[PDB]
C-alpha cells in the first residue's frame, strides 16, 4: 500500500474533467510516473513529474503535486472517450537506474459521451442459421441509465458498450441479452 | 520497441519459456504478470547479462539473460494459478519503462478441455429497420475453453472498425467453457444492398505444431472460426 490511487473507479461525461488521485507515505519518493494502459494493451508512459516539481502538463493532461501532503493528482481536461481506460501511477526515490517503481493498484477510467435525443428501444434477433435461438438487443438508450444484472442460471447479459459510427457524428449504446431457453421475448427484463 | 509470444497453452506439470527482447540497447529488463481483472505483479529484474534480483513474486520462477537484447522467462513446472498475462518491461537512462504487447499464457490441468469456440451469427431486426432505420449484426462465440480468441469483422473482405463493438472480456458460462458476443451496426439502405457481404471473425489460438494428442479427434490448432452473411431484403 505505498502507492495508494484513488478512486477506485473513476466515470465521467465526455467535455467534463477526469480526476485521478494518488498518496504516498515515504518521503523517499522524488520520481512519479503516469502509465496508461488500453485493453488487451500493456501500459505506455503518458506523463511524469519530480516531487522538486509543483505541476506538470502535457497538452490536456495535467498533474499537481503536494509534497508537504504526500499527495498527487492527474487531471484529464476535455476528457474524451477515446482516452477511457485504467491509469496507473507509479513511484520512485532516487530516479536514477534500478528506480525500483512502485506501483499503483490503478484507477479506471470510462469516459461517457454526450448524446442528444436517445430513442431507446429494444430488439429480438434471430440466427438463421440454428432456429429457435432468441436473442435480446437493447440500443439509442442514455448512457447514466444503469444496464439491469441478472442470474436466471441460463440467461447472460453483457455489460453496456458504446458504438461509433464515422457516419453522421452521433455515438450509440448497446447490450446483449441470451438464454439457452427455446421460448423467450425480450420484452420483459 | 519491445516484443514477445502473444499466446500459449501449456499443460500444467511441464516447463514453459517466455522470450523477450528490445533494440535501444539499454541495460535493465523487467518480468511482470498481471491477472486480467486487476494487479500488476512484479516477478524478477535483470540489472545486466548474468544479473538478475528477485522480485515482489519469484517463487516459481527463474530467469535468463545471457545477452543484452534478450530476456528469457522460465517455468520449471507450470502450475493453475501462474494464468495470468506476462508483460516484459524494459528501461533506458531511468526516465520511463517500455512495456511489450504481453503474452496471455493459460495453464492447464487436462488439454482435453481444449476446444474452439463455436461462432453464430444473428439477423437484424425488422423493427430495427423499421423504426430507427438502421441494423446491427450480432455475433456470438461460444464452446471455447482459452481466452485466446480475437474477434474481428470484416465487410466485403475488408477488416472494419467503424461501427464494431466487442465485449472486453469472455464470459464464464460452465467451468470448462467461455462465451463471448460482439456488434456491427450499419445504415439499412447498406443492409438491403444483397453486394455487401458481411463476416464476423473469431481468432483462435490453440496448440502447436509439437503437441501430443489422440488420433480419433481433431487437434485444437491455432485456427480462425466465422461466420458469413448477406444484404437481405
Known amino acids: 500500500q505505498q502507492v495508494r490511487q484513488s478512486p477506485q473507479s473513476l466515470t465521467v461525461w465526455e467535455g467534463e474533467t477526469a480526476i485521478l488521485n494518488c498518496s504516498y507515505e515515504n518521503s523517499a519518493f522524488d520520481y512519479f510516473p503516469w502509465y496508461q494502459q488500453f485493453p488487451g494493451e500493456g501500459p505506455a508512459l503518458l506523463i511524469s513529474?519530480?516531487?522538486v516539481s509543483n505541476k506538470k502538463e502535457d497538452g490536456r493532461f495535467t498533474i499537481f503535486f503536494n509534497k508537504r501532503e504526500k499527495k498527487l493528482s492527474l487531471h484529464i481536461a476535455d476528457s474524451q472517450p477515446g482516452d477511457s481506460a485504467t491509469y496507473f501511477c507509479?513511484?520512485?526515490?532516487?530516479?536514477?537506474?534500478?528506480?525500483?517503481?512502485?506501483w499503483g493498484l490503478g484507477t479506471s477510467l470510462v469516459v461517457n459521451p454526450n448524446i442528444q435525443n436517445p430513442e431507446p428501444a429494444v430488439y429480438q434477433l434471430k440466427d438463421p442459421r440454428s432456429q429457435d435461438s432468441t436473442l435480446c438487443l437493447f440500443t439509442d438508450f442514455d448512457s447514466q441509465i444503469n444496464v439491469p444484472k441478472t442470474m436466471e442460471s441460463g440467461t447472460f447479459i453483457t455489460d453496456k458498450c458504446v458504438l461509433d459510427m464515422k457516419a453522421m457524428d452521433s455515438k450509440s449504446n448497446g447490450a446483449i441479452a441470451w438464454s439457452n431457453q427455446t421460448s423467450f421475448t425480450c420484452q420483459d427484463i | 520497441v519491445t516484443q514477445m509470444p502473444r499466446y500459449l497453452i501449456k499443460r500444467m506439470g511441464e516447463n514453459v519459456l517466455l522470450e523477450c527482447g528490445q533494440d535501444?540497447?539499454?541495460?535493465?529488463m523487467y518480468w511482470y504478470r498481471q491477472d486480467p481483472g486487476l494487479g500488476l505483479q512484479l516477478i524478477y529484474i535483470?540489472?545486466?547479462?548474468?544479473?538478475?534480483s528477485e522480485g515482489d513474486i519469484p517463487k516459481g520462477y527463474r530467469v535468463s539473460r545471457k545477452k543484452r537484447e534478450h530476456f528469457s522467462l522460465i517455468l520449471d513446472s507450470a502450475k493453475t494459478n501462474q494464468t495470468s498475462v506476462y508483460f516484459c518491461?524494459?528501461?533506458?537512462?531511468?526516465?520511463?519503462?517500455?512495456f511489450g504487447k504481453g503474452t496471455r499464457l493459460t495453464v492447464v490441468e487436462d488439454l482435453r478441455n481444449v476446444t474452439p469456440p463455436k461462432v453464430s451469427l444473428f439477423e437484424p431486426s425488422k423493427a430495427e429497420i423499421a423504426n430507427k432505420q438502421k441494423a446491427t449484426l450480432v455475433c456470438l462465440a461460444r464452446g471455447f475453453f482459452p481466452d485466446h480468441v480475437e474477434l474481428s469483422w470484416w465487410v466485403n473482405g475488408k477488416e472494419v472498425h467503424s461501427g464494431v463493438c466487442t465485449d472486453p472480456q469472455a464470459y464464464k458460462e460452465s467451468n470448462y467453457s467461455y462465451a463471448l458476443s460482439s456488434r456491427l451496426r450499419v445504415s439499412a439502405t447498406f443492409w438491403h444492398n444483397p453486394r455487401n457481404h458481411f463476416r464476423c471473425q473469431v481468432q483462435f489460438h490453440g496448440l502447436s505444431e509439437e503437441d501430443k494428442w489422440p488420433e480419433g479427434s481433431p487437434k485444437p490448432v491455432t485456427q480462425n472460426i466465422s461466420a458469413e452473411a448477406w444484404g437481405r431484403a
Open positions: 535501444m540497447s539499454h541495460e535493465t
Open positions: 507509479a513511484a520512485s526515490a532516487s530516479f536514477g537506474d534500478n528506480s525500483k517503481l512502485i
Open positions: 535483470s540489472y545486466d547479462v548474468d544479473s538478475n
Open positions: 518491461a524494459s528501461s533506458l537512462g531511468h526516465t520511463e519503462v517500455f
Open positions: 513529474i519530480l516531487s
